[PDB]
Ligand binder design. Structure first.
Ligand SMILES: O=C1c2ccccc2C(=O)N1CCOC(=S)Nc1ccc(Cl)cc1
Lengths: 401, 551
C-alpha cells in the first residue's frame, strides 16, 4: 500500500533508449509474457504522451524451455543512483566472500507485490518491437517494482529484512546479501547441511511469494602470471622472458629483470643459465604468486574488467580500478567465442558482486555489432553490466598466459 | 468530421507556460482570406471563438488561399512524445498478398480531437485592418497542422481505432503511414472490395472519411522510393541522364540513385564515381570522369538496362544469404529463398579499420547482413561464403578478437578469400636475425631508420618528414628488403608488431602496403618484440647507431 516516493536525480531526465531489434521468437515470447503481466495488472498500456523508453530482451530461464523477460535498466539506474545507492543503499558484508559455500537465489518475483510510485511509473516505459516495423509496436509501463531496476531492492529492504529476520536469528552465522533480484546466502556448513538451510530458507520466502547456485568463493585463487621452467633457454626464450618480466615490473613492486638481461646475437642460439640467473626469476617467482603490494579497493571508484581471448576455450581476465593496479585476476574455460565470452562475463560479474558488491565495466575484445547481435542468445543472469569494446594489445594477451 | 475517440492528455514542459507571441498585422486580403477559412473550420468544429481571457496567442498568417499557423513557441514549450520516427518496413520483408488497396484519410489531423485542457494554449488572433481593433480570437479543438504531438497522437488515435477491426479480421494486413492506410489480404477482387467497404464504414464510424471505390487507387504503389505490387517489389523507376559535363552535384545525385538501386539490382558499383568526389569542391565544379568511372557508369547502365524485381518473404522457408568479393574492399550480397529469386540485393564497402584483411572484411559484411536480416525477417539467414571452412578456423582460432558467424558453408565463386601470408609461430634456424629500430626528433620532424644483424651487417637509411612511429615501420620494412627469403625481425615497437601481427592484406598506408607486398614475397618471416631501453644485445646496438645524432 505505502508507496515510496521515488524521485529522479536533480536535473537529469528519464531514459530514452531505442529498442534493439529482436528475433521473431523472442517477440512472440514477449507478447505472451506481457499479455499475462498486464492481465495481472503489473504493467499497463501507455499513450504517446510518454516519450521514455528502455530496451527489453527475452532470455531463457536457466538454460531451460521457459522464456524470461529481461529489461535493460542500465540507463535508468545511472539516473537514479543517488536514490538506490546514497539514499537507500544496501551495505555489502565482507564476510560473504570468506564462506565455504554461497548459494544464489532469484527472489525478484517478489517485487511485483509492492506498487511503484505512480509519479515514477512513466520512466519505466518500454517497447515491444515488431518484425520489419510492420506494426507500430506495443508500449507498456510498470505499475509495480520492476525487476532489473536497482530501485526495487532499495525499496524492498524493509520487507526483505522482515522476511529474513526469523531465519537470520536461528542462523546467526549464515550471511545473506541482496543484489538486484538475487539473494546471496553463504555458510561454512558442510554441503548437505548448507543445502538444507537453503531449502529451510526457501520455505520462509515462500510465505511471501516464491539449491539455486552452488558457489565456493573461499576457494577462489589468484591466477599468478607464470614464468616458463624450460630447461635450456634461447635468446628468444630469454628475450620473451624479460619481456613479460618487464611488464610485471610495472606491477608487483620489486620485480627485477636485469641479471637476466646481460645474457648482436642470433635468435635461435641457445644459452647457458647464469648463477645470477636462477637467483632472479627464482625470486621473481616468489613474488607474483604473492598478492600485489600497495593495491586496495576504493569503494568510491568503480571496477573495470578486461578479458583476453587465449584461444582454446581459455580466457584470462583482470579486475582493477586504476590500470595495472588490479584487485583480482583469474581464468575461465556447442561452444563459440561469443558463447564462452558471455559466460566469462557472467562468471566474472558474479564473483565481483560477491567480493565488492558491485559489477565491473567490461572491456570486451569483440565487435560491438557482433556482441549486441548474439550476447542475449546465451545470457542467463538477471542483471546487465556496463561494457565497452576494445582491441587486445598483442603483448598483453601473452603476459597473462 | 471529428472522431469520438478519447483524447491524449498533453502537457507543457515542467518549468514553462503557454505561448504569448504578439500578432504582426497582415495585408487586407490576407485578413479577408483568414476570416473566410476560419468561419468554414468554425462551422466544422475545428476551431472556436474565445473570450479575452486566454492570455495565450500564437501568430497566424495566410499564403496563396490557405492558413498557416506558426507554432514554434508552443512547440518549444510543449513536451516530448514517443518518437513516431522509428523504422520503415522494408518491402523485402513483406509477405505476398492477393489484393492490395490504399486508403488515405482526409483532413487527418483536423479529424482528431485535442486534449481539452490544452486547447487554450493554441489560441491565435485574426488581426483587424491593422491593429486598433480587438480581433477575432480562436483556439483549436483538434490537432493543429504544424504542432508537434500531432503526428504522434494521430498515429496513436488511428491505431486504437484500427484495433477492433483488426481483431475481428486477423487475416487482414493494415499498415498506417501518415495520411495513408495500406490494406492487403489474400482474397479475390470481389470480397476484398467488400472487406474494404466494411473498413471504410468502420473507419467512418470513428470520424475518418476515405475515398470511395470510384476514386480509390490500385497497384503498383509508389512508397518511400519503392514500387509496390501485391506479388513483387522494386525501387522506383530511375533514369541515368546522358551528359558530357558532370557537375559534382550531378555525380552526387547519381551516386545516391545507384546506392538506392543496389537494394535490388545486383552488381551496382560506385567506387570509381565516389573517388571523383574525394576533395573539397563546389557542387557546380565539373569533374572529368576518370576511365574507370566512365566504364563503371557503362555497366551500371547495363544492369539497369532491364527492370528487376524482388520477391516477397515466405515465412516457412530459410533465408539464403550469398556474398561475393567484387574488387578490393568491395563486397556484394544477395538474399533469396528459392535459388535466385532475390528478396533483396546489397553491397558493402565499409571498413573502418586503418589496416585490415579479407577475412575480417568478409566477417564484417556477414555481421551487417546478419543484423539487417534480423530486423527485416526476424530470423537469421544461412550463409554461403567464398572462404574455405578451414581457412576460416585457422583465422578464427589464432586471432585475438572474439567472432561468431551464423550457420554458413563454402561456395566456390572466385575470387576466393585467403590469408596472403602467415607469420612464423617460432624463430627460424639459420635465418638472419634483424634487430630493427626507429628514431625521430620531435622538433625538426626528421629521423633515421636502420638495423643490425647477427651476421655483422648494418644500415641506417635516413628519412625526412616522419613520426616516431614511421621510423619503426620504415625500419622493419628495410629489414625486409635486404633480407633473404627467410628472416626473423626484432622490434621494440608494439605499434608495428600490432599492425603486422594481425596479417593485414591492405592498408590506407603507403608504407604498410609495401611491407605487405614484401611479406608476401618471403617464405618464412618471424617477428618478435623486446622492451626498449633495456640491455638487449641488438635493440640497444641498433639504438646506439639509430639514435646517434638526430635523437
Ligand atoms: O507493412 C506494410 C507496408 C509497408 C509499405 C507499404 C505497404 C504496406 C503494407 O500493406 N504493409 C502491411 C503488410 O503488407 C504485407 S504483409 N504485404 C504486402 C503489403 C502491401 C503490398 Cl502492396 C504488397 C504486399
Amino acid at each position: 500500500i505505502e508507496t515510496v516516493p521515488v524521485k529522479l536525480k536533480p536535473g537529469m531526465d528519464g531514459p530514452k533508449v531505442k529498442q534493439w531489434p529482436l528475433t521473431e521468437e523472442k517477440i512472440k515470447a514477449l507478447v505472451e509474457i506481457c499479455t499475462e503481466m498486464e492481465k495481472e495488472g503489473k504493467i499497463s498500456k501507455i499513450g504517446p504522451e510518454n516519450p521514455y523508453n528502455t530496451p527489453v530482451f527475452a532470455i531463457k530461464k536457466k538454460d531451460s524451455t521457459k522464456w524470461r523477460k529481461l529489461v535493460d535498466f542500465r540507463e535508468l539506474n545511472k539516473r537514479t543512483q543517488d536514490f538506490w545507492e546514497v539514499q537507500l543503499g544496501i551495505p555489502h558484508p565482507a564476510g560473504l566472500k570468506k564462506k565455504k559455500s554461497v548459494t544464489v537465489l532469484d527472489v525478484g518475483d517478489a517485487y511485483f507485490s509492492v506498487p511503484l510510485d505512480e509519479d515514477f511509473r512513466k520512466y519505466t516505459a518500454f517497447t515491444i518491437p515488431s518484425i520489419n516495423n510492420e506494426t507500430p509496436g506495443i508500449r507498456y509501463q510498470y505499475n509495480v517494482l520492476p525487476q532489473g531496476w536497482k530501485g526495487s531492492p532499495a525499496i524492498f529492504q524493509s520487507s526483505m529484512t522482515k522476511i529474513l529476520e526469523p531465519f537470520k536469528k536461528q542462523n546467526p552465522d549464515i550471511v545473506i546479501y541482496q543484489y538486484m533480484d538475487d539473494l546471496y546466502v553463504g555458510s561454512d556448513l558442510e554441503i548437505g547441511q548448507h543445502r538444507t538451510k537453503i531449502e529451510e530458507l526457501r520455505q520462509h520466502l515462500l510465505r511471501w511469494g516464491l539449491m539455486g547456485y552452488e558457489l565456493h568463493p573461499d576457494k577462489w585463487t589468484v591466477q599468478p602470471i607464470v614464468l616458463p621452467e624450460k630447461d635450456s633457454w634461447t635468446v628468444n626464450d630469454i628475450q620473451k622472458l624479460v619481456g613479460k618480466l618487464n611488464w610485471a615490473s610495472q606491477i608487483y613492486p620489486g620485480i627485477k629483470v636485469r641479471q637476466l638481461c646481460k645474457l648482436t646475437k642470433a635468435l635461435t642460439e641457445v644459452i647457458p643459465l647464469t648463477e645470477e640467473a636462477e637467483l632472479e626469476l627464482a625470486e621473481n617467482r616468489e613474488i607474483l604468486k604473492e598478492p600485489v603490494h600497495g593495491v586496495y579497493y576504493d569503494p568510491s571508484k568503480d571496477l573495470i574488467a578486461e578479458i583476453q581471448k587465449q584461444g582454446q576455450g581459455q580466457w584470462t581476465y583482470q579486475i582493477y580500478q586504476e590500470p595495472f593496479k588490479n584487485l583480482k585476476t583469474g581464468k575461465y574455460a556447442h561452444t563459440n567465442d561469443v558463447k564462452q565470452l558471455t559466460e566469462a562475463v557472467q562468471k566474472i560479474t558474479t564473483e565481483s558482486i560477491v567480493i565488492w558488491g558491485k559489477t565491473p565495466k567490461f572491456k570486451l575484445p569483440i565487435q560491438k555489432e557482433t556482441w549486441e547481435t548474439w550476447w542475449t542468445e546465451y545470457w542467463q543472469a538477471t542483471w546487465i553490466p556496463e561494457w565497452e569494446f576494445v582491441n587486445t594489445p598483442p603483448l598483453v594477451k601473452l603476459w597473462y598466459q | 468530421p471529428i472522431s469520438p475517440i478519447e483524447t491524449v492528455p498533453v502537457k507543457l514542459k515542467p518549468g514553462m507556460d503557454g505561448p504569448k507571441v504578439k500578432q504582426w498585422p497582415l495585408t487586407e486580403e490576407k485578413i479577408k482570406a483568414l476570416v473566410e477559412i476560419c468561419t468554414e473550420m468554425e462551422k466544422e468544429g475545428k476551431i472556436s471563438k474565445i473570450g479575452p481571457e486566454n492570455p495565450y496567442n500564437t501568430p497566424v498568417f495566410a499564403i496563396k488561399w490557405r492558413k498557416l499557423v506558426d507554432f514554434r513557441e508552443l512547440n518549444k514549450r510543449t513536451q516530448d512524445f514517443w518518437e513516431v520516427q522509428l523504422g520503415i518496413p522494408h518491402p523485402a520483408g513483406l509477405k505476398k498478398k492477393k489484393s492490395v488497396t490504399v486508403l488515405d484519410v482526409g483532413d487527418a489531423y483536423f479529424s482528431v480531437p485535442l486534449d481539452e485542457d490544452f486547447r487554450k494554449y493554441t489560441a491565435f488572433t485574426i488581426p483587424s485592418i491593422n491593429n486598433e481593433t480587438p480581433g477575432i480570437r480562436y483556439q483549436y479543438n483538434v490537432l493543429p497542422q504544424g504542432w508537434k504531438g500531432s503526428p504522434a497522437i494521430f498515429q496513436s488515435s488511428m491505431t486504437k481505432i484500427l484495433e477492433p477491426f483488426k481483431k475481428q479480421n486477423p487475416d487482414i494486413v493494415i499498415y498506417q503511414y501518415m495520411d495513408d492506410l495500406y490494406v492487403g489480404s489474400d482474397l479475390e477482387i470481389g470480397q476484398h472490395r467488400t472487406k474494404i467497404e466494411e473498413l471504410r464504414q468502420h473507419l467512418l464510424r470513428w470520424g475518418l472519411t476515405t475515398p470511395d471505390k470510384k476514386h480509390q487507387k490500385e497497384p503498383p504503389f509508389l512508397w518511400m522510393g519503392y514500387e509496390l505490387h501485391p506479388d513483387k517489389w522494386t525501387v522506383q523507376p530511375i533514369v541515368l541522364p546522358e551528359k558530357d559535363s558532370w557537375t559534382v552535384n550531378d555525380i552526387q545525385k547519381l551516386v545516391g540513385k545507384l546506392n538506392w538501386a543496389s537494394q535490388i539490382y545486383p552488381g551496382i558499383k560506385v567506387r570509381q564515381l565516389c573517388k571523383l568526389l574525394r576533395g573539397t569542391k563546389a557542387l557546380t565544379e565539373v569533374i572529368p570522369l576518370t576511365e574507370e568511372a566512365e566504364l563503371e557508369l557503362a555497366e551500371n547502365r547495363e544492369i539497369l538496362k532491364e527492370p528487376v524485381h524482388g520477391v516477397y518473404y515466405d515465412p516457412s522457408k530459410d533465408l539464403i544469404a550469398e556474398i561475393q568479393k567484387q574488387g578490393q574492399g568491395q563486397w556484394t550480397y544477395q538474399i533469396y529463398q528459392e535459388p535466385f529469386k532475390n528478396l533483396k540485393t546489397g553491397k558493402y564497402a565499409r571498413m573502418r579499420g586503418a589496416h585490415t584483411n579479407d577475412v575480417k572484411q568478409l566477417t564484417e559484411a556477414v555481421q551487417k547482413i546478419t543484423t539487417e536480416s534480423i530486423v527485416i525477417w526476424g530470423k537469421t539467414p544461412k550463409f554461403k561464403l567464398p572462404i574455405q571452412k578451414e581457412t576460416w578456423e585457422t583465422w578464427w582460432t589464432e586471432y585475438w578478437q572474439a567472432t561468431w558467424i551464423p550457420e554458413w558453408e563454402f561456395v566456390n565463386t572466385p575470387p576466393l578469400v585467403k590469408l596472403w601470408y602467415q607469420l612464423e609461430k617460432e624463430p627460424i634456424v639459420g635465418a638472419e636475425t634483424f634487430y630493427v629500430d626507429g628514431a625521430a626528433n620531435r622538433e625538426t620532424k626528421l629521423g633515421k631508420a636502420g638495423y643490425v644483424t647477427n651476421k655483422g651487417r648494418q644500415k641506417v637509411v635516413p628519412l625526412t618528414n616522419t613520426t616516431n612511429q614511421k621510423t619503426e615501420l620504415q625500419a622493419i620494412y628495410l629489414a625486409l628488403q635486404d633480407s633473404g627469403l627467410e628472416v626473423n625481425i626484432v622490434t621494440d615497437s608494439q605499434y608495428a608488431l600490432g599492425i603486422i601481427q594481425a596479417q593485414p592484406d591492405k592498408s590506407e598506408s603507403e608504407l604498410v602496403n609495401q611491407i605487405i607486398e614484401q611479406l608476401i614475397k618471403k617464405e618464412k618471416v618471424y617477428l618478435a618484440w623486446v622492451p626498449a631501453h633495456k640491455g638487449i644485445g641488438g635493440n640497444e646496438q641498433v639504438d646506439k647507431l639509430v639514435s646517434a645524432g638526430i635523437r
